[PDB]
Design an enzyme around this catalytic site. Structure first.
Site, PDB file in Angstrom:
ATOM      1  N   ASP A  13     -25.127   0.296   8.703  1.00  0.00           N
ATOM      2  CA  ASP A  13     -24.126  -0.218   9.641  1.00  0.00           C
ATOM      3  C   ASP A  13     -22.844   0.463   9.224  1.00  0.00           C
ATOM      4  OD1 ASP A  13     -22.552  -3.386  10.665  1.00  0.00           O
ATOM      5  OD2 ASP A  13     -21.662  -1.429  10.301  1.00  0.00           O
ATOM      6  N   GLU A  60      -0.333  11.830 -10.341  1.00  0.00           N
ATOM      7  CA  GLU A  60       0.013  11.050 -11.512  1.00  0.00           C
ATOM      8  C   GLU A  60      -0.068   9.592 -11.066  1.00  0.00           C
ATOM      9  OE1 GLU A  60       3.768  13.898 -12.843  1.00  0.00           O
ATOM     10  OE2 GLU A  60       4.161  12.448 -11.266  1.00  0.00           O
ATOM     11  N   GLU A 120      -0.274   5.502 -11.859  1.00  0.00           N
ATOM     12  CA  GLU A 120       0.115   4.498 -12.876  1.00  0.00           C
ATOM     13  C   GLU A 120      -0.603   3.127 -12.777  1.00  0.00           C
ATOM     14  OE1 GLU A 120       4.269   4.577 -12.236  1.00  0.00           O
ATOM     15  OE2 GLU A 120       4.486   6.685 -12.905  1.00  0.00           O
ATOM     16  N   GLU A 147       3.615   4.303 -19.607  1.00  0.00           N
ATOM     17  CA  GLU A 147       4.720   4.160 -18.661  1.00  0.00           C
ATOM     18  C   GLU A 147       5.889   3.222 -18.982  1.00  0.00           C
ATOM     19  OE1 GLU A 147       5.371   6.897 -15.761  1.00  0.00           O
ATOM     20  OE2 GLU A 147       6.360   5.024 -16.420  1.00  0.00           O
ATOM     21  N   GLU A 184      -0.497   5.459 -17.662  1.00  0.00           N
ATOM     22  CA  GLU A 184      -0.612   6.493 -16.652  1.00  0.00           C
ATOM     23  C   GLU A 184      -1.394   7.611 -17.296  1.00  0.00           C
ATOM     24  OE1 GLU A 184       3.306   8.137 -15.803  1.00  0.00           O
ATOM     25  OE2 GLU A 184       2.584   9.696 -14.449  1.00  0.00           O
ATOM     26  N   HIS A 204       2.522   9.530  -7.676  1.00  0.00           N
ATOM     27  CA  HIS A 204       3.117  10.778  -7.165  1.00  0.00           C
ATOM     28  C   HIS A 204       2.116  11.828  -6.747  1.00  0.00           C
ATOM     29  CE1 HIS A 204       6.541   9.685 -10.130  1.00  0.00           C
ATOM     30  NE2 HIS A 204       6.552   8.919  -9.052  1.00  0.00           N
ATOM     31  N   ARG A 261      17.918  10.549  -9.389  1.00  0.00           N
ATOM     32  CA  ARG A 261      17.486   9.206  -9.758  1.00  0.00           C
ATOM     33  C   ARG A 261      16.149   8.836  -9.140  1.00  0.00           C
ATOM     34  NH1 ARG A 261      20.912   7.826  -5.235  1.00  0.00           N
ATOM     35  NH2 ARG A 261      18.657   7.954  -4.802  1.00  0.00           N
ATOM     36  N   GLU A 282       6.857  17.279  -4.995  1.00  0.00           N
ATOM     37  CA  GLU A 282       6.306  16.001  -5.479  1.00  0.00           C
ATOM     38  C   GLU A 282       6.732  14.890  -4.526  1.00  0.00           C
ATOM     39  OE1 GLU A 282       5.481  14.772  -9.553  1.00  0.00           O
ATOM     40  OE2 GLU A 282       7.402  13.758  -9.622  1.00  0.00           O
ATOM     41  N   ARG A 288       7.086  11.303  -4.184  1.00  0.00           N
ATOM     42  CA  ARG A 288       6.946  10.160  -5.069  1.00  0.00           C
ATOM     43  C   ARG A 288       6.728   8.733  -4.585  1.00  0.00           C
ATOM     44  NH1 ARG A 288      10.059   9.067  -9.286  1.00  0.00           N
ATOM     45  NH2 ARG A 288      11.675   9.076  -7.654  1.00  0.00           N
TER      46      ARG A 288
END
Ligand code: GLN
Ligand code: GLN
Ligand code: GLN
Ligand code: MG
Ligand code: MG
Ligand code: MG
Ligand code: MG
Ligand code: MG
Ligand code: MG
Ligand code: MG
Ligand code: MG
Lengths: 443, 15, 443, 15, 15, 223, 15, 15
Positions: free
Chosen positions: A52, A131, A133, A188, A195, A244, A315, A332, A334
């Site tokens: 199914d 990557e 976590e 982390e 991670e 990421h 940041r 990347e 994130r």
């Protein structure tokens, strides 16, 4: 390819396999399987085991419908912890409509068709070095998951890691005995966090590992007394797990994003790319950040992005151009959290990229000062549109754009909004413990 | 709001 | 009026009052007070007592700002449960800027300031008849609200003579000893839901009542061992506490919406008044259903309104016209829940009322047919817009409808959006158990 | 719609 | 800061 | 309080996270039955006696804090944003000014110094205010720019650009800022003084050497 | 009723 | 020496 029919078959006889599990992945992502015995390996290879299929539409299966299982010979693997009365193997499979045709809807084969589109544009590959976590919580006598972190370590910590490393090694020294090529593992930011990051790979080949991982991590973490969980933001105020997605497009065996004597060694190939991923970042978040909690992660602070823009120093950027270049030149993304369907993410992500490269969109002003000092007005001033505030606003915009809907495709799209507004109304009709502690004595 | 991440980062570093 | 300087002062000493509360009601809709000793009553009546009237801004107060305290003599009442060595009375109060000029942003004064406008339009009294509902939970050895309902009754039951209504009475029998004219009491749909309705009276004389009410209810419930609570939808799954509001414009001692030889004996005044209401229904939501839980009441199936329509014999209409006419002829706004500042409600409710009668807006076709049986697409094929689904959806609709803004005041406006963007601001960055049970084993 | 709250409206009436 | 002001305000009318 | 089974403590900031207790002082001077701070024709209806007195408190403010906030705990109430007046500046408005000039005039015209807390010595405390309140009336001192905008939203370094210096941070930072001020000294009694300066340093030197479990959550394990 | 089954469906996925 | 008296005088006041 990698494994041949007579190849598998000798691996089983010699290795003594007594149980084959036919993996495919559902829409919400959940890696489900259909278990058969080595006794039926033949009809399994012949692409003839039916099942199914709406088991993919998740908790929105309307009708039972027979589908096939075309197993990739390369996604083959045996399990070590199940190494007693006949080890226990698993493949990964291409769901196919009953007649002969691929299943339009299969999360997976949807990345392969958003991948065909790549070739038709000239590129040869695509690469994802993710990557991911994860928190490790302790279980109890009973065996239930508690809210007690496994450790109290922090960014890249050592001695404190040992309680969760004692596992982080167990996890990482088993995947090697599974065929993995794990670049490396640290610890982390918040306690209990961890991670591991592995070697990049081609879209499908990688997401294949995404799935696998999430599974070997939980299998090995339970076999230690703890409960591995991938909630985006499991504890309040504490930092969220992310995942990421470092991408890079190839075109004839060579990094298309690389360009030596160019502004930032960047090509006018990766620019239109960054440009596109900046052109649906709010309309593919429903997919990338698909649950209700993924939006308790996207709160300014805990390093999680909150606003749309890019750089090579910032940041919490929505985009992030790793500095290493060459065959490593990469973008990347994130925002993607480990509660996102590998498959469908790569879909909206390589589709929002290839709508730039074609249309030739032109990327914006990479940032360096602060997108946190100008409010929501001084930000929605320069192409800095905040990512959605809730799964629901997250859906509002997803529907709002064509390029995306074509990215999943009618059947996948429809069941998803469908499967997801449900998730929203419950959480929205629900009365929580917070709503109560507040208003019970004030009102 | 690196101050909240730092607020994230430091509430821990310190409790 | 009702009482005089002399009346008050002789009353106090003949009845032996030893302590005086000077009651006002903050914006968030909490009843506050500043207490003085019978000795100071005079300087109190001289309208001379002062305070930090930023206690009104609620928790978005930022600057100790001096303010006077003008009691209204007619809002006088002594409390009986006391007498323990000094009976303790109370007054309501008009707040006044440092200069004899009423404080523009005082919830209360705003209703009177909204009332002025009506007079200039000509209506003599604007009256309100509340139907406020509540749950009485049980307390513990410690004395802490628990989740234990009081009774296991339902609509209008004869709750045996000891536990169910033995509380319902105690309240009702006391309010008369305080000068309230209760029209009556019963039980309500849910296990532990009650309701006592009182007579009608000027907006301002009725908001007072409301404030007072919530208070006494709460002080006689502890007296019985239970926890009173008027919070909107305390318990999930079970029906909520609403606080319907029956309005009725007057013109020199006569009811305005009354017209004997007319369409449902409904004047072209009420056909217009209903119109202003129906118009700003989505805009004035954040004020009448002002908290994060008021919206887990506004979902279909519990009798509570979720759509914008007006009938007089219907499912769950946002408006309701009690059949009886005459002086009684009155509109019934049923989306108003007891945890909204009664004061600001009359205001924004008596405001949208005046926006219609004025521009002479036009009533729409009263919904009697199957409003619940369609979709928000098919109903969208009519003048039936939805009521917001979260406080945030409700704040947006508010800052936009200009006439709404002008009903509170540049001031009562600002701090309100302020304190509410924060209330929403925290309930969504938080992580509720709910989120954790789903995504901990699944994701 | 109404069938879920009524569906609830009923559950407690009948327990 | 006022934010810590309004902060140390908003951990009392929010609890 | 006890009578009703509770405990009552006038301690400045017993609990962290939580507001502390501020014993605010409302001050007003007269000269023959008539409020001297008051003034019909004037800006803020404020007599010069006032701007004169104001500049007074605004000068020495940093100093007599050792005497208006004498406990080790007192410096943890004056943290930023709990309404505690962390900066030297006067106003009839603002997040938390050191001096608040009420709105009532007539005879109530007055100066509120909110620096002071319940764990102070009422009398001493008071002689030091009347103190800097008078240096100023006598040496005809010039009041400064009342607080408009707001200085909280500023560095310690842009503020420093205005006559704005913070308040002492520790009971130790105070004492020394008290010793070096000639008018609190002569203000208190050369005796009340040697015994106060002293009585507290010892206090400070006893807080300063202990090992507060705080450090243990912090160092016992990591290092 | 799919709506009950769906409802039914919904009680074991959302738990 | 007073230093041990003071000292003994202090241990009260400071406890
Ligand atoms: N890179 C980080 O340490 C931040 C992790 C968090 N899950 C975001 O992303
Ligand atoms: N009177 C009623 O039963 C209606 C109350 C329901 N809680 C709404 O409002
Ligand atoms: N009364 C108040 O304004 C309280 C302020 C606070 N307790 C100090 O500082
Ligand atoms: Mg990274
Ligand atoms: Mg990282
Ligand atoms: Mg303000
Ligand atoms: Mg009723
Ligand atoms: Mg009603
Ligand atoms: Mg004060
Ligand atoms: Mg002189
Ligand atoms: Mg000196």
């Amino acid at each position: 390819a990698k494994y041949t029919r007579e190849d598998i078959e000798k691996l089983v006889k010699e290795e003594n396999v007594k149980y084959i599990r036919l993996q495919f992945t559902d829409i919400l992502g959940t890696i489900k399987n259909v278990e058969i015995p080595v006794s039926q390996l033949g009809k399994a290879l012949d692409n003839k085991v039916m099942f199914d299929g709406s088991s993919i539409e998740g908790f929105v299966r309307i009708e039972e419908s027979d589908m096939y299982l075309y197993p990739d010979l390369n996604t083959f693997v045996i399990f070590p912890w199940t190494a007693e009365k006949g080890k226990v193997a698993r493949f990964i499979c291409d769901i196919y409509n009953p007649d002969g045709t691929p299943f339009e809807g299969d999360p997976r084969n949807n990345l392969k068709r958003i991948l065909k589109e790549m070739e038709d544009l000239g590129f040869s590959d695509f690469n994802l070095g993710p990557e991911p976590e994860f928190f490790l919580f302790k279980l109890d006598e009973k065996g239930e998951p508690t809210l007690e972190l496994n450790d109290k370590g922090g960014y890249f910590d050592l001695a404190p890691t040992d309680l969760g490393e004692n596992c982080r090694r167990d996890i990482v020294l088993e995947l090697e005995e599974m065929g993995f090529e794990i670049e490396a593992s640290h610890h982390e930011v918040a306690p209990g966090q961890h991670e591991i990051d592995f070697k990049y790979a081609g879209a499908v080949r990688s997401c294949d590992d995404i799935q696998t991982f999430k599974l070997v991590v939980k299998t090995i973490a339970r076999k230690h007394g703890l409960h591995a969980t991938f909630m985006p933001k499991p504890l309040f105020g504490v930092n969220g797990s992310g995942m990421h997605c470092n991408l890079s497009l190839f075109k004839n065996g060579v990094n298309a994003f690389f360009d030596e004597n160019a502004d930032l060694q960047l090509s006018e190939t990766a620019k239109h790319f960054i440009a596109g991923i900046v052109k649906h970042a709010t309309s593919f978040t429903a997919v990338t950040n698909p649950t209700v909690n993924s939006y308790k992660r996207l709160v300014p602070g805990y390093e999680a992005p909150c606003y749309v823009a890019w750089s090579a120093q910032n940041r919490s950027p929505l985009i992030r151009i790793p500095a290493s270049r060459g065959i490593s030149t990469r973008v990347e993304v994130r925002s993607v959290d480990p509660a996102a369907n590998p498959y469908l993410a790569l879909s909206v992500l390589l589709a929002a990229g290839l709508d730039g490269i074609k249309n030739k969109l032109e990327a914006p002003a990479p940032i360096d000062r602060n997108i946190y000092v100008m409010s929501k007005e001084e930000r929605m001033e320069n192409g800095i549109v905040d990512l959605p505030a809730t799964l629901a606003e997250a859906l509002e915009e997803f529907k709002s754009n064509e390029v995306m809907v074509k990215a999943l495709g009618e059947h996948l799209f429809e069941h998803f909004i469908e499967a997801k507004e449900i998730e929203w109304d419950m959480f929205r009709t629900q009365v929580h413990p917070w709503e109560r502690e507040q208003y019970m004595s004030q009102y | 709001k690196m101050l909240e991440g730092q607020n994230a980062h430091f509430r821990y570093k310190n409790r």
